[PDB]
Amino acid sequence: GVFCYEDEATSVIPPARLFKSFVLDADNLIPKVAPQHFTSAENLEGNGGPGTIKKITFAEGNEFKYMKHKVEEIDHANFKYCYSIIEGGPLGHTLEKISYEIKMAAAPHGGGSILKITSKYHTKGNASINEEEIKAGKEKAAGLFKAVEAYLLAHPDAYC
C-alpha cells in the first residue's frame, strides 16, 4: 500500500532559504541536522533538475549504507521539491519506493514560511506500512523539520 504522510510547520525564514537549505543543500545540511541518522552525501548521477539521483549516506547508530534519493520535480519558484527513494535502508525489506513532496508556502507568520515535507511509502506487495520502518520515517522527517527550524533559526541568512 502507498501510505501518505505530511508534516506542515512554520519557519523564521522566507521559504526560498528554507527550500534551499532542506532540499537543495540536503547533501550536507540534513546530515549535519540529524547527524545521528545521515552522515554525508554525493550527487550520484543527474542534471541538477529532476531525473537526478543523489546518494545520501545513511545511519542507525553507526553508518549503515548509502541511500539513493531520486529528484522527481524541483520548484524553487513555489519552494517545492519532490523526490523519491529507489534504494535505501527503508527500501530494504518492505518498501518498493518512498516519495517525498516538499512544498514551501507563505505563512501568517512575520518574515516566515510554511515548510512542507510530504513522504509517501510504497510498501511492497509482500509488506505493509511497516509499523517499524514508517514510524521511523515519519519521526526522522520530523527530526529534520524541527532541527532545521532551530538550525535555520540560527542561520536564517545562510540560504539567502
Describe the protein's architecture and organization.
Residues 1-155 form the Bet v I/Major latex protein domain. One of its GO terms (molecular function) is signaling receptor activity. Pfam families: Bet_v_1. This protein is α+β, with helices and mostly antiparallel strands and 160 residues long. The chain has one domain (1-160). The chain is built from three helices and seven strands. The chain has helices at 15-24, 30-33, 133-154; strands at residues 2-11, 38-45, 52-60, 62-75, 80-87, 95-105, 113-123. The protein has a seven-stranded antiparallel sheet with strand order 1-7-6-5-4-3-2. Strand 2 (38-45) and strand 3 form a beta hairpin. Helix 1 (15-24) packs across helix 3 (133-154). The longest helix has 22 residues, at 133-154.
